Amino acid sequence: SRRLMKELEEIRKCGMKNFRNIQVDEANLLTWQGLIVPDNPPYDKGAFRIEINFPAEYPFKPPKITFKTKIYHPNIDEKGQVCLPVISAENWKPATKTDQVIQSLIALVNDPQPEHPLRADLAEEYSKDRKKFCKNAEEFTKKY
């Protein structure tokens, strides 16, 4: 609750890379709305809206990310559950500010880590074909 002040009010802090946002609800700042604008891979121009959700017990608990705008990515499920380590516990640290959480995911988009794919499907189609993926994705990106 508290800490969401200084970080957020720290938006006028230059124009970062790939992220327009604001409070989807407007009331108790525990749910953020936004857009990550990728820059290289198949997700090339076809932005995505994201909803950040950190529990009242933030910063002692990590926030959880959910894609609002569908995406063809290995490390993400249809249900939108993202899986970036920096926040998924057994890594989480109280000091890491949300500047790192976003950005970190942006990197996970710009470079999928099919190590432990949240969908073995697109993983194999990604590793054993950096084409039959970029096409079938940039075409899913362009539409959705």
Binding site: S1, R2, R3, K6, N28, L30, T31, N53, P55, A56, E57, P59, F60, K61, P62, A89, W92, K93, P94, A95
Partner: protein, 350 residues
């Protein structure tokens, strides 16, 4: 009059149990210290321990099911902890309390998973920062990193003495750990105080009402020959959960059979030869399957009185069980190698 005697009916166990036990307490609670004899309304039979065992399993099962929301479960540790959000459940908390106490007096071990803090609180000792390690792991890591931080706390994390506890639909409520928590900023000089207060709230303050009922219930059966006369809490866990005894020899003896097997039988002898050569994990899998748990009652596995009953001729079906009677349902397979393959896929599956 021997025995406590709880006459209840499935589908209203918790309810009739509370009503009943309440009354029995009112009138000479001592009776809550006699051997428990259970009766399900409309079920002829004699409770030799199994009915009582069934009772235990059912109450335990219902109470720790999220549905009634008295306890939250932690995937990470496979333990339960009290839900501060539990509204109007004094009776229920008092009930598993009375139940945990009866389990000890009836040498009946339960399948409960609590972090060690629960047993400390039962003995009157408050919970602490170190105790959070097992009840709220993620929250402990944060707080520990708070104390371990090298940088500048006040500017780097700016949190205050005020905290928040939410529920279900993301509606945070604020709580002041100190007078005007809102202002008083956490720094490197007061971070310790903060951790102490936050640890206190959470393990003691936030779940007071419900834990106190729990303890009151446990104590209605535990006075006189108390937990005192016991140094550490691990002693109470062992009385409720059993030791990790794996005699098996001895578990073999005291074993009885039904359906026409008896001591001498190719299927039986092959079975013991299989069981014995098992690897501890497997031996514990077998217990977990046959009985409702992988531990042992006071006096070792021999006290279990397991029963191996023939359940049909050779087939391709996996053996089964009625854990509240330690009954192992064993089809008369045509091969030792098949006995071991079927028994295994059974105890390993679930």
């Amino acid at each position: 009059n021997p025995y406590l005697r709880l006459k209840v009916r499935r589908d209203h166990i918790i309810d009739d149990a509370l009503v009943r036990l309440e009354m029995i307490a009112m009138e000479n609670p001592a009776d809550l210290k006699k051997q428990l004899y259970v009766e399900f309304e409309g079920e002829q039979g004699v409770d030799e321990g199994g009915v009582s065992k069934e009772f235990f399993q059912l109450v335990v099962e219902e109470i720790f099911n999220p549905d009634i929301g008295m306890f939250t479960y932690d995937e990470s540790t496979k333990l339960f902890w009290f839900n501060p959000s539990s509204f109007e459940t004094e009776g229920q908390f008092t009930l598993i309390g009375i139940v945990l106490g009866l389990a000890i007096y009836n040498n009946c071990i339960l399948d409960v998973h609590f972090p060690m803090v629960v047993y400390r609180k039962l003995m009157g000792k408050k919970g602490t920062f170190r105790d959070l390690g097992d009840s709220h792991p993620v929250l402990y890591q944060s707080l520990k990193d708070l104390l371990e931080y090298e940088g500048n706390v006040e500017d780097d994390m700016m949190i205050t003495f005020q905290i928040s506890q939410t529920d279900l639909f993301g509606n945070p409520m604020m709580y002041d750990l100190k007078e005007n928590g809102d202002k008083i900023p956490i720094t490197n000089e007061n971070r310790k105080e903060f951790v102490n207060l936050y640890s206190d709230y959470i393990l003691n303050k936030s779940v007071e009402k419900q834990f106190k009922a729990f303890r009151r219930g446990f104590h209605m059966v535990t006075n006189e020959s108390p937990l005192k006369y016991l140094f550490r809490p691990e002693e109470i866990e062992l009385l409720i959960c059993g030791s990790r005894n794996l005699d098996f020899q001895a578990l073999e003896e005291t074993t009885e059979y039904d359906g026409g097997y008896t001591r001498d039988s190719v299927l039986i002898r092959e079975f013991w030869e299989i069981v014995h050569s098992f690897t501890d994990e497997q031996k514990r899998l077998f217990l977990q399957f046959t009985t409702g748990t992988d531990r042992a009652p006071v006096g070792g596995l021999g006290k279990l009185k397991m029963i191996i009953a023939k359940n049909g001729p050779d087939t391709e079906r996996l053996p089964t069980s009625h854990t509240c009677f330690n009954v192992l349902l064993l089809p008369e397979y045509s091969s030792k190698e098949k006995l071991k393959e079927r028994l295994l896929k059974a105890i390993t599956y679930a």
